[PDB]
């Protein structure tokens, strides 16, 4: 049921 | 990559050379020092990768020695000439000890070889050899330490050449 | 050609004059094999010629070839020579002048090569060793840029003329810049030390053209070889020919000099290793590899200088020109065009290996083997046709006559190809006249 | 601006910033984007670029992706806005982002998500919250013809309108011309018209991380959305399809190339799905099941595309399908869809969600742009080298073996300029000897050998001479299955000759050695697909970097060279390398066929007997 | 004796058959392939060998791909 | 014929890409991982 949503935008962040 | 180190150990017993001066023979200690310096100059002359380590073995202690002439060679020689005169001027006999501190000088040489080998670039291999010149009488009590030095050198595979002038020493033969 | 190659062919007088400089003797000794160095050390204080058999008996029989090579090197360099030893023997003795200068250099004594800068004191405008290296790179970059023909590089006229005598660039049309030859491209693909070495070899072969003494230049080069990095030296005490040569070197960037009126000059690491030729400096820390090679025959350059862009464009098709990056593709057309221009595949492969990016150094092969093989195949396809003009002999009525004429041709060495079964052969047109006359004479002899 | 070297001078429009090492992306104003795989930020940049950019080249180090309006619409359907994407690009672009690229994104993003198409009560409604654009669309005469009107000719009247089903595809092309792409949003949970199906996922089913990621990309905001997904052969594509069907749980239709694929899908659903077998029916010409109670149907393009008169039962099945409303439809080998007959099937079937799964998308007829509106944008495409490293797929060891042509063959090769020239280079005796040596080597190595040969005559000749099974045109199904099962289990049989039918007409038993002799003529997609289908992950050789072996026998100096180079273009774009080998060690020691010259001369006689008619 | 002076060419026998085809078909025009000498060698006139090289290069261009 | 087989072997084995490769090997003289099973045997 994990198919509802998935994003990795926060993983793309300045470090 | 052949990093050849030529270690020179000198029998700097003042008694033997004083007697030889009394004999007024053709050969003196100054000639021995000049020959050693010339040999070291030739060793560094053969290749840049070659390195020189010269330690003077005196009764008091062991001293690390190191115009148409090579500038670096001139500087090294003047350093060595400075070191030997510095030792001789301060060379005061205080005690009845006559045997040369042969084992201790060898241990210092081995430690210096180990230090340089650690500093050797891994892309190059360091062959090391030790040359010792014998003039005075051999030492008796240093036998255990001498054997330990021989064992350590054989473990690290370091050739040791002994040069006899007057007195033969079976310890050097076995070494 | 290495340093001994130029030395090995010199006339006796030049070698004798060069041996008058102790630094020259030091360099020559350091260039000797280890066995040769041992021999010289043995002969250091020998005032008597040494019998040839006596010297030859010291070395092992198996290592005689190395011994014989060392012996021939010593003889050709005239380090030693043979003397009519009394009793019919032929002794071997070093050159007295060479050995004397070597002993002077090693043991000391004699006059120094040049005075120090303590007379003039510390330099008011002293520079830095990295700055010296950067300037030397800039000068060589300027030379390569001028060879490319970009207007960003302006050099002296004789410098271009120097290359013209070197054969790199030929002035097809006067007034216009000379067009660089194929050998020029081959040199351009060579690595910087080889570039400098070949350029200086060409300079030496044409030393007499400028009226400059051959002996002085070589001895000065040997002196520069042992120079201390970051240290200047006195310009004074040198001939006007040496002054002009030093001006040429400063124009090359091998030596740094503030002004033409300056009496100090700083040798550079590039000039330091010039004496060694191509070998010796195996641990050269060059610029990091900025070129990435992908399996799709694509190259990526982390550079901005027009020099590397031009170099890559000589053999590949540019696709994108980023401010700090360049994307090009390896194509059969571009590679074959470069080969037709005279560049060999091995030069391209070696150059790519030189500038390989450290990321690609992680791979067990420096470059993808498939790409290397494809480059080699493209190079081979260019010269598939074997063109050989010649004269065909095919009218041999007797096999014995054909065999005899084949023997005569192999005696003459003008045979191109032969077929005993068909009794046919091919000869060079120049040797054809000789073989034709021989054939007629044999019929005349018959 | 163009430099004299051919490189486009982009320095002026790309202002570099000092964040070089940190920022791994290069954004060329041409639309191409470059990423460094060695960067520490590769993974995040990779994931970001997958949603927003279409991949072009994926070699070991420097990857190139491309930006398309379809990619941007797919990213919007994922749920990413303009500002976040632009900010992430700026944080990753080494230089300044070109304004034209920025303007292009601005133009595309605004027009996205405007027009929506909904299928309800067998009626297609075009709706938007902005009637101004809707009213503007009424102007188009093509739209006017496409828009459903009354039987009197009068056009019908949040405002929407019904649309003619048979005019949908032409409208879709017009939407791009109108710059308002359709929005394929499905009520994954809000559907009430179509009842659910008692079908679930058995615990034996495991979703690999890339599989789950692709599924989550497909199911934006929990709602199923039509699209195209690229999965390498043997990556459990059928498992992914079964998983998606179970997830949607609505009426499910699957289309395959042959009945063998239908049986594979049925076995997969029996292997993973919990649906009752009684609700599973195959609309095949041989095995027929009533459409009634068929919760999930598997069929083929030809059965639905049979324009000629069909069986009366088939008429009933078609009527039931048209009456049935399909929440979900599944299409396999999407590259085949651009054909007119198979495209007509899309108009025939009324389905809400249509998902296409395939291994390749490089149609040699470049009929893929219109395919973006037939189904949708490409949702996902996994990195083949990455799956190789992860061990999911066998690491293929690829070789190009050059066989010099016999001069007599070569002279005749030059002699013939027609299509008959194919037989000349496809029947090279030196190639035959090389193939025989390779077969002996791999049989001594105890490997499964699959010989692919497009030419029927060449394949039969090779198989008969080598005394091996051969598969060709007719290939009676019982004999075919018998030979396949012998190959799978019988150790005596490990060399199978398969003609062009081996691409998609049936499943290929897993092998390790694949030797390609005959080419279609540059079918860079077909042969690559067949190669990927042949070779799959094998246990035991997992540690080694070369667990699968593929060899292409190419006749030197022939037109086969150009075909091979054109064909391997896609595989090189996939990061697969091909090493050229000319000399085969060990051939001289071994005795092989056509050792003597007249044997090759006899073969030349046999081939020339097959004139242009054959 | 009548002995001819021309150019010797050594290549693969496939190229030999290609040259035979060119001479027989007269694609080069006049019969410049005067005589063959070996299974891997031929003897031609240098007058037209340059243009012959062009035709040879064109053939291998056809058996290639442009990128 | 034995002579026919020898001629065919010489021709095929050295027709185009050996007439220079053999000479290069005579005039000259990672890889293991990049070599094929039949090249390593």
- Cα–Cα dist B19/C61, whole Å: 47
CB-CB contact of D531 with D467 (8 Å): no
Which of D31, D38, D23 lies closest to D52, judged by CA?
D31
Are residues C30 and B46, on separate chains, in Cβ contact within 8 Å?
Answer: yes
Locate C40 and state its tokens: 């010289």
How large is the C-alpha radius of gyration of chain C? 28
Are residues C296 and D573, on separate chains, in Cβ contact within 8 Å?
Answer: yes
Task: Quickly list H helices, D455-596.
Answer: 456-466, 477-489, 524-534, 559-573
Terminal-residue alpha carbon distance, chain C = 52
SS3 D236: coil
Method of elucidation: cryo-EM
CB-CB contact of C363 with D60 (8 Å): no
Chain-centroid distance of CA D429 in Å reads: 35
CB-CB contact of E28 with D527 (8 Å): no
- Cα–Cα dist D571/B114, whole Å: 55
DSSP C59: S
B30-53 per-residue burial string, b: 16 or more CB within 10 A, e: under 16: eebbeebbbbbbbbbbbeeebbbb
Comparing alpha-carbon positions, the chain D residue that sits nearest to A11 is D44
Where on the phi/psi map is residue C7: left (φ > 0), alpha (ψ -120 to 50), or beta?
Answer: alpha
Mutating which of D25, D39, D42, D59 best tests the C interface, going by the most C Cβ atoms within 10 A?
Answer: D59
Alpha-carbon dihedral angle through residues E42, E44, E48, E50, given to the nearest 10 degrees: 40
Are residues D562 and E16, on separate chains, in Cβ contact within 8 Å?
Answer: no
Locate D184 and state its tokens: 């394929």
CB-CB contact of D597 with D433 (8 Å): no
Identify all chain F residues contacting D595, using CB atoms and an 8 Å cutoff. 5, 8
Which of D529, D532, D540, D549 lies closest to D449, judged by CA?
D549
Burial of C38 (0-12, 13-18, 19+ CB in 10 A): middle
The angle formed by the CA atoms of residues C123, C124 and C129, to the nearest 5 degrees, is: 55
CB-CB contact of D36 with D26 (8 Å): no
The angle formed by the CA atoms of residues D404, D409 and D413, to the nearest 5 degrees, is: 100
Domains and CATH numbers, chain E: 3-64 (3.30.70.1220)
- Cα–Cα dist D399/D401, whole Å: 6
- Cα–Cα dist E64/D565, whole Å: 8
- Cα–Cα dist C136/C316, whole Å: 28
CB-CB contact of D259 with D282 (8 Å): yes
CB-CB contact of C222 with C27 (8 Å): yes
Other chains touching C, judged by 3 or more CB pairs under 8 Å: B, D, E, F
Please enumerate, as own/partner, the contacts of D543-546 that have beta carbons within 8 Å and a separation of 24 or more: D544/D395, D545/D395, D545/F33, D546/D395, D546/D396, D546/D397, D546/F36, D546/F37
Other chains touching F, judged by 3 or more CB pairs under 8 Å: C, D, E
From the CB of residue C188, how many other CB atoms can be counted at a distance below 10 Å?
A: 20
Q: Which helix (H) or strand (E) holds C67?
A: helix C64-76
Tell me the binding residues of D for ATP.
231-238, 533, 536
- Cα–Cα dist F17/C377, whole Å: 8
For residue D426, give how far its alpha carbon lies from the nearest alpha carbon of chain A (Å): 50
Locate C98 and state its tokens: 């060479």
CB-CB contact of B101 with B57 (8 Å): yes
Burial of D78 (0-12, 13-18, 19+ CB in 10 A): buried
- Cα–Cα dist D473/D498, whole Å: 10
CB-CB contact of C378 with C338 (8 Å): no
D21-48 per-residue burial string, b: 16 or more CB within 10 A, e: under 16: eebbbbbbbebbbbbbbebebeebbbbb
- Cα–Cα dist C249/C253, whole Å: 6
Terminal-residue alpha carbon distance, chain B = 28
From the CB of residue C66, how many other CB atoms can be counted at a distance below 10 Å?
A: 15
Are residues C369 and F34, on separate chains, in Cβ contact within 8 Å?
Answer: yes
- Cα–Cα dist D519/D439, whole Å: 19
Identify all chain C residues contacting D20, using CB atoms and an 8 Å cutoff. 324
For residue F22, give how far its alpha carbon lies from the nearest alpha carbon of chain D (Å): 12
Q: Which helix (H) or strand (E) holds C388?
A: strand C386-393
CB-CB contact of D338 with D367 (8 Å): yes
For residue B93, give Cα distances in angstroms to B59, B64, C32: 8, 19, 47
D547-573 per-residue burial string, b: 16 or more CB within 10 A, e: under 16: bbbbbbbbbbbbbbbbbbbbbbbbbbb
- Cα–Cα dist C324/D95, whole Å: 9
Q: Is A7 on the interface with D (CB under 8 A)?
A: yes
Q: Helices C214-225 and C192-205 meet at what angle, rounded to 10? A: 150
Length of chain F: 41
- Cα–Cα dist D299/D349, whole Å: 12
Phi, psi angle pair for C55, to nearest 5°:
-65, -45
Are residues C370 and D10, on separate chains, in Cβ contact within 8 Å?
Answer: no
Are residues E14 and D562, on separate chains, in Cβ contact within 8 Å?
Answer: no
**Site of tokens 């954004």:** D27
- Cα–Cα dist B112/B66, whole Å: 11
Locate F17 and state its tokens: 């890409």
Which of C101, C84, C102 lies closest to C92, judged by CA?
C84
Other chains touching D, judged by 3 or more CB pairs under 8 Å: A, C, E, F
The residue range of the domain holding B148 is: 3-175
Task: For chain E, give the secondary structure using H, E and C.
Answer: CCCEEEEEEECCHHHHHHHHHHHHHCCCCCCCCCEECCCCEEEECHHHHHHHHHHHHHHHHHCCCCC
* Parallel/antiparallel/unpaired status of strands D25-27 and D32-36: antiparallel
For residue F9, give how far its alpha carbon lies from the nearest alpha carbon of chain D (Å): 8
Instruction: Tally the domains of chain B.
Output: 1
**Site of tokens 């050295």:** F14
* Parallel/antiparallel/unpaired status of strands C424-427 and D25-27: unpaired
For residue C364, give how far its alpha carbon lies from the nearest alpha carbon of chain F (Å): 5
CB-CB contact of C427 with C391 (8 Å): yes
C294-321 per-residue burial string, b: 16 or more CB within 10 A, e: under 16: bbbbbbbbbbbebbbbbbbbbbbbbbbb
C-F Cβ pairs (cutoff 8 Å, strict): 17
Comparing alpha-carbon positions, the chain D residue that sits nearest to E21 is D411
Q: Helices D82-92 and D99-111 meet at what angle, rounded to 10? A: 160
Q: Helices C332-340 and C369-382 meet at what angle, rounded to 10? A: 50
Identify all chain D residues contacting F41, using CB atoms and an 8 Å cutoff. 441, 585-586
CB-CB contact of D226 with D473 (8 Å): no
Identify all chain C residues contacting D576, using CB atoms and an 8 Å cutoff. 295
**Site of tokens 């820390």:** C285
DSSP code string of F1-41: -HHHHHHHHHHHHTSSTTTTHHHHHHH---TTTTS-TTT--
Q: Is C380 on the interface with F (CB under 8 A)?
A: yes
Q: Looking at chain B, which runs of residues are DSSP E strands?
A: 2-12, 51-58, 62-64, 125-134, 159-164
Phi, psi angle pair for C326, to nearest 5°:
-135, 130
Q: Is C125 on the interface with F (CB under 8 A)?
A: no
Which of D258, D240, D253 lies closest to D379, judged by CA?
D240
For residue B22, give Cα distances in angstroms to B93, B161, D20: 18, 29, 78
SS3 C215: helix
Locate D158 and state its tokens: 């949040």
CB-CB contact of D542 with D391 (8 Å): yes
Instruction: Please list the residues that pair with C329 across neighbouring strands.
Output: C298, C317
Closest partner residue to C365 among F17, F20, F30, by Cβ?
A: F30
Count H helices and E strands in chain A, helices first. Answer: 0, 0
CB-CB contact of D38 with C363 (8 Å): no
Phi, psi angle pair for B166, to nearest 5°:
-115, -50
Instruction: Please list the residues that pair with D163 across neighbouring strands.
Output: D124, D147
Chain-centroid distance of CA C286 in Å reads: 20
Mutating which of C101, C107, C109 best tests the B interface, going by the most B Cβ atoms within 10 A?
Answer: C107
Closest partner residue to C321 among D7, D572, D577, by Cβ?
A: D7
Q: Is F28 on the interface with E (CB under 8 A)?
A: no
- Cα–Cα dist D394/A6, whole Å: 29
Burial of C324 (0-12, 13-18, 19+ CB in 10 A): middle
Burial of E28 (0-12, 13-18, 19+ CB in 10 A): middle
SS3 D157: coil
From the CB of residue D264, how many other CB atoms can be counted at a distance below 10 Å?
A: 17
Identify all chain C residues contacting B45, using CB atoms and an 8 Å cutoff. 26, 29-30, 106
CB-CB contact of D329 with D346 (8 Å): no
Closest partner residue to C320 among D10, D20, D572, by Cβ?
A: D10
Instruction: Please list the residues that pair with D164 across neighbouring strands.
Output: none
CB-CB contact of D67 with D52 (8 Å): yes
SS3 D223: strand
Task: Quickly list H helices, D120-180.
Answer: 131-137, 141-146, 168-177
SS3 C415: strand
- Cα–Cα dist D343/C443, whole Å: 88
How are the residues of chain A apportioned to helix, strand and coil, as percentages rounded to the nearest 5? 20, 0, 80
The angle formed by the CA atoms of residues D406, D407 and D409, to the nearest 5 degrees, is: 65
């Amino acid at each position: 049921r994990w198919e509802g949503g998935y994003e990795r935008t926060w993983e793309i962040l300045k470090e | 990559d052949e990093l050849n180190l030529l270690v020179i150990v000198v029998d700097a017993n003042p008694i033997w050379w004083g007697k030889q001066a009394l004999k007024e023979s053709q050969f003196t200690l100054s000639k021995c020092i000049d020959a050693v310096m010339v040999l070291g100059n030739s060793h560094l002359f053969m290749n840049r990768s070659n390195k020189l380590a010269v330690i003077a073995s005196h009764i008091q202690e062991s001293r690390f020695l190191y115009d148409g002439k090579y500038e670096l060679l001139t500087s090294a020689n003047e350093v060595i000439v400075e070191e030997i005169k510095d030792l001789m001027t301060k060379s005061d006999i205080k005690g009845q000890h006559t045997e040369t501190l042969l084992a201790g000088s060898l241990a210092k040489a081995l430690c210096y070889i180990h230090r340089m080998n650690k500093e050797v670039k891994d892309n190059q291999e360091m062959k090391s050899r030790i040359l010792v010149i014998k003039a005075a009488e051999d030492s008796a009590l240093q036998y255990m330490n001498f054997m330990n030095v021989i064992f350590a050198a054989q473990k690290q595979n370091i050739l040791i050449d002994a040069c006899v002038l007057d007195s033969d020493s079976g310890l050097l033969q076995q070494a | 050609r290495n340093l001994q190659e130029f030395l090995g062919g010199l006339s006796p007088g030049v070698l004798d004059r060069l041996y008058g400089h102790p630094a020259t003797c030091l360099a020559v000794f350091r260039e000797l094999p280890s066995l040769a160095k041992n021999w010289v050390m043995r002969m250091l204080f020998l005032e008597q010629p040494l019998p040839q058999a006596a010297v030859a008996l010291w070395v092992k029989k198996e290592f005689s070839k190395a011994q014989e090579e060392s012996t021939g090197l010593l003889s050709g360099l005239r380090i030693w020579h043979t003397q009519l030893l009394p009793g019919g023997l032929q002794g071997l003795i070093l050159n007295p002048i060479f050995r004397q200068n070597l002993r002077i250099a090693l043991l000391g004594g004699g006059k120094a090569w040049s005075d120090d800068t303590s007379q003039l004191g510390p330099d008011k405008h002293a520079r830095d060793v990295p700055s010296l290296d950067k300037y030397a790179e800039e000068r060589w970059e300027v030379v390569l840029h001028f060879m490319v023909g970009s207007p960003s590089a302006a050099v002296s006229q004789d410098l271009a003329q120097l290359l013209s005598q070197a054969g790199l660039m030929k002035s097809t049309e006067p007034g216009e810049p000379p067009c660089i030859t194929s050998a020029g491209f081959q040199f351009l693909l060579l690595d910087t030390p080889a570039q400098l070495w070949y350029f200086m070899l060409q300079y030496l072969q044409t030393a007499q053209s400028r009226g400059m003494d051959l002996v002085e230049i070589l001895s000065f080069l040997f002196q520069l070889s042992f120079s201390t990095l970051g240290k200047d030296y006195s310009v004074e005490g040198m001939s006007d020919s040496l002054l002009n040569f030093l001006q040429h070197l400063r124009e090359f960037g091998l030596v740094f000099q503030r002004k033409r009126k300056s009496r100090r000059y700083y040798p550079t690491r590039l000039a330091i290793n010039l004496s060694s030729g191509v070998s010796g400096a195996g641990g050269t820390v060059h610029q990091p590899g900025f070129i990435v090679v992908e399996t799709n025959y694509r190259l990526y350059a982390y550079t901005e200088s027009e020099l590397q862009i031009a170099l890559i464009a000589l053999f590949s098709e540019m696709l994108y020109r980023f401010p700090n990056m360049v994307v090009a593709q390896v194509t059969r057309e571009s590679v074959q065009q470069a080969i037709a221009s005279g560049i060999t595949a091995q030069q391209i492969i070696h150059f790519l290996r030189t500038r390989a990016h450290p990321v690609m150094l992680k791979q067990t092969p420096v470059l993808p083997p498939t790409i290397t093989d494809q480059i080699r195949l493209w190079e081979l396809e260019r010269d598939r046709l074997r063109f050989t003009e010649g004269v065909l002999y095919n009218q041999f009525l007797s096999q014995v006559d054909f065999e005899l004429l084949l023997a005569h041709a192999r005696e003459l060495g003008v045979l191109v190809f032969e077929n005993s079964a068909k009794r046919l052969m091919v000869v060079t047109p120049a040797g054809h006249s000789d073989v034709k006359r021989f054939w007629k004479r044999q019929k005349h002899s018959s | 601006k163009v430099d004299e070297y051919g490189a486009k001078d982009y320095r002026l429009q790309m202002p570099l910033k000092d964040d070089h090492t940190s920022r791994p992306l290069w954004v060329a104003p041409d639309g191409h984007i470059f990423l460094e795989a060695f960067s520490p930020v590769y993974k995040y940049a990779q994931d970001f670029l997958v949603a927003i950019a279409e991949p072009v080249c994926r070699p070991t180090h420097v990857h190139e992706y491309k930006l398309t309006a379809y990619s941007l619409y797919a990213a919007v359907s994922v749920g990413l806005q303009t500002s976040d994407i632009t900010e992430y690009l700026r944080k990753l672009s080494k230089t300044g982002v070109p304004d034209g690229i920025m303007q292009f994104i601005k133009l595309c993003t605004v027009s996205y998500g405007k027009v929506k198409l909904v299928l309800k009560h067998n009626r297609y409604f075009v709706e938007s919250c902005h009637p101004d654009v809707i009213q503007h669309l009424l102007q188009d005469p093509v739209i006017r013809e496409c828009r459903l009107r009354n039987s009197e000719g009068e056009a019908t009247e949040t405002v929407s309108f019904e649309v003619k089903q048979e005019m949908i595809e032409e409208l879709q092309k017009r939407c791009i011309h109108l710059e308002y792409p359709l929005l394929a949003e499905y009520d994954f949970r809000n559907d009430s018209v179509n009842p659910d199906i008692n079908i679930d996922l058995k615990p034996t089913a495991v979703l690999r991380p890339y599989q789950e990621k692709s599924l989550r990309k497909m199911f934006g905001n929990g709602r199923a959305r039509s699209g195209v997904i690229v999965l390498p052969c043997g990556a459990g594509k059928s498992l992914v399809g079964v998983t998606a069907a179970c997830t949607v749980r609505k009426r499910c239709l699957v289309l395959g190339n042959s009945a063998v694929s239908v049986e594979q899908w049925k076995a997969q659903f029996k292997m993973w799905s919990t649906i009752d077998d009684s609700q599973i029916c195959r609309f095949t010409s041989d095995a027929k099941d009533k459409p009634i109670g068929c919760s999930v149907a598997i069929s083929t393009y030809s059965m639905l595309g049979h324009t000629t008169k069909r069986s009366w039962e088939a008429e009933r099945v078609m009527e039931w399908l048209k009456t049935q409303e399909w929440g979900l439809m599944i299409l396999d080998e999407v590259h085949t869809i651009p054909a007119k007959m198979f495209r007509r099937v899309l108009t025939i079937v009324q389905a809400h969600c249509k998902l296409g799964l395939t291994a390749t998308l490089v149609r040699e007829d470049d009929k893929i742009v219109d395919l973006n509106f037939l189904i949708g944008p490409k949702l996902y495409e996994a990195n083949w080298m990455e799956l190789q490293n992860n061990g999911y797929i066998a690491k293929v060891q690829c070789a190009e073996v050059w066989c010099p042509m016999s001069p007599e063959f070569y002279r005749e090769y030059v002699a013939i300029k027609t299509k008959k020239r194919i037989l000349l280079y496809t029947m090279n005796p030196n190639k035959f000897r090389a193939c025989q040596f390779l077969i002996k080597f791999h049989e001594r190595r105890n490997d499964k050998i699959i010989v692919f040969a497009d030419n029927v005559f060449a394949l039969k000749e090779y198989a008969i001479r080598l005394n091996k099974p051969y598969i060709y045109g007719p290939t009676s199904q019982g004999e075919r299955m018998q030979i396949l099962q012998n190959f799978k289990h019988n150790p005596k049989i490990n060399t199978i000759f398969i003609s062009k039918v081996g691409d998609t007409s049936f499943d290929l038993p897993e092998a390790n050695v694949l030797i390609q002799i005959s080419s279609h003529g540059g079918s860079r997609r077909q042969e690559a697909q067949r190669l990927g289908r042949v070779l799959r992950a094998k246990k035991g050789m997992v540690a080694e970097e070369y667990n699968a072996f593929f060899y292409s026998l190419v006749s030197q100096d022939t037109q086969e060279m150009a075909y091979s180079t054109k064909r391997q273009r896609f595989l090189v774009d996939q990061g697969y390398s091909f090493k050229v080998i000319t000399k085969l060690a060990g051939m001289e020691e071994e005795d092989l066929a056509f050792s003597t010259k007249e044997e090759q001369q006899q073969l030349l006689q046999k081939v020339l007997a097959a004139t242009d008619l054959d | 004796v009548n002995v001819l002076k021309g150019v010797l060419i050594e290549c693969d026998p496939a190229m030999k058959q290609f040259l035979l085809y060119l001479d027989e078909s007269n694609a080069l025009g006049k019969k410049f392939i005067i005589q063959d000498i070996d299974d891997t060698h031929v003897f031609v006139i240098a007058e037209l060998v340059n243009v012959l090289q062009e035709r040879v290069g064109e053939l291998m261009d056809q058996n290639a791909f442009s990128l | 014929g034995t002579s026919s087989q020898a001629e065919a072997a010489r021709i095929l084995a050295a027709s185009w890409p050996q007439n220079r490769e053999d000479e290069e090997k005579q005039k000259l003289k990672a890889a293991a991982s990049h070599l094929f099973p039949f090249e390593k045997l």
